[PDB]
Amino acid sequence: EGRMQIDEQPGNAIGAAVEGFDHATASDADIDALKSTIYTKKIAVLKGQDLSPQQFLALGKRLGRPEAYYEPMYQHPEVTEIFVSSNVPENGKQIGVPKTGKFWHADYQFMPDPFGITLIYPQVIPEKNRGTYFIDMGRAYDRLPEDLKKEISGTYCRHSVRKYFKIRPHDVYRPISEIIEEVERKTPAVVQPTTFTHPMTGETVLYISEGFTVGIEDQDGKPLDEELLKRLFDATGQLDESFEHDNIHLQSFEQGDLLVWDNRSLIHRARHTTTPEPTVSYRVTVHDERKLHDGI
Ligand SMILES: C[N+](C)(C)CCO
Numbered sequence: 001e002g003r004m005q006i007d008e009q010p011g012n013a014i015g016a017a018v019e020g021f022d023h024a025t026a027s028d029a030d031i032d033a034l035k036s037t038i039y040t041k042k043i044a045v046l047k048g049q050d051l052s053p054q055q056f057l058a059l060g061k062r063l064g065r066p067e068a069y070y071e072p073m074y075q076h077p078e079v080t081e082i083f084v085s086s087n088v089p090e091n092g093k094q095i096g097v098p099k100t101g102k103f104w105h106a107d108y109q110f111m112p113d114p115f116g117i118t119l120i121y122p123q124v125i126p127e128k129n130r131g132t133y134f135i136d137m138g139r140a141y142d143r144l145p146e147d148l149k150k151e152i153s154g155t156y157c158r159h160s161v162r163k164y165f166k167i168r169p170h171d172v173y174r175p176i177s178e179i180i181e182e183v184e185r186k187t188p189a190v191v192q193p194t195t196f197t198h199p200m201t202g203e204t205v206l207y208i209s210e211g212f213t214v215g216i217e218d219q220d221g222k223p224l225d226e227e228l229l230k231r232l233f234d235a236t237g238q239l240d241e242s243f244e245h246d247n248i249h250l251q252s253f254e255q256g257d258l259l260v261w262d263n264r265s266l267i268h269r270a271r272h273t274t275t276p277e278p279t280v281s282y283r284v285t286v287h288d289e290r291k292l293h294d295g296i
């Protein structure tokens with residue numbers, strides 16, 4: 001320690017900037033303060049980071065236990081634990097996967113044991129159409145009409161990667177039903193409480209996303225009409241294709257920025273592809289000291 005400085009946005013405004021962060025020398029109290037900032041301000045932007053893939057993973061290890069993405073075509077060639085979103089060929093070759101996350105989601109929401117913190121280290125940044133959209137789903141919950149809160153009290157949601165699973169080079173010439181069935185076998189839909197208590201802040205989080213949440217079920221386990229999910233998506237801002245809804249936060253960044261955010265509370269998505277500008281980003285996803293929620 002001796003130089004890390006966190007500047008939190010005032011009041012209820014989302015976000016914080018962190019200057020002078022060096023993951024190799026930060027103290028234990030520094031890391032604890034940074035983590036408190038992530039859980040309360042939801043997005044911490046580390047400034048002036050110039051890291052190799054190896055150093056990026058080491059930074060993530062300061063915060064928690066990294067997990068490699070379960071489909072290895074997304075993995076960085078040198079560091080299995082880095083997820084690569086890229087549409088810039090490297091010597092003509094495709095590294096990682098292009099056009100990822102073009103839908104509202106929380107990371108690993110379709111898995112039984114989602115990690116609590118996501119780190120994004122942008123490498124190639126669109127000049128004009130840059131940034132990632134975010135919605136804080138605890139704040140979104142609080143802003144729901146009281147009756148809508150009542151309607152989802154006691155319900156459960158099913159989450160699945162089945163809509164957005166990407167065809168892999170190995171899948172060419174396979175019948176489509178075989179892949180559909182493989183996805184159900186490898187990543188069966190996961191049931192979660194529709195709302196859960198955030199272990200670090202105590203706040204109630206509405207844990208749904210247009211991208212991964214495929215059904216809602218009652219406190220007896222019987223499916224409810226998906227019109228309820230549409231009304232929740234609509235109320236929380238996830239159906240607004242203009243991205244002007246009051247819940248929506250556009251997070252921009254510049255070279256050297258490294259975003260760390262609360263993957264319990266937030267959902268995020270890429271912007272519309274309104275320009276041909278490329279994107280390359282490295283992702284590290286870590287488990288912190290608690291499960292997603294205490295029922296996991
Ligand atoms: C990387 N995501 C899990 C967000 C989508 C890929 O299907």
Ligand SMILES: [Cl-]
Nearest residue numbers: 106107108109
């Ligand atoms: Cl994910």
Ligand SMILES: [Zn+2]
Nearest residue numbers: 101105106107
């Ligand atoms: Zn994501």
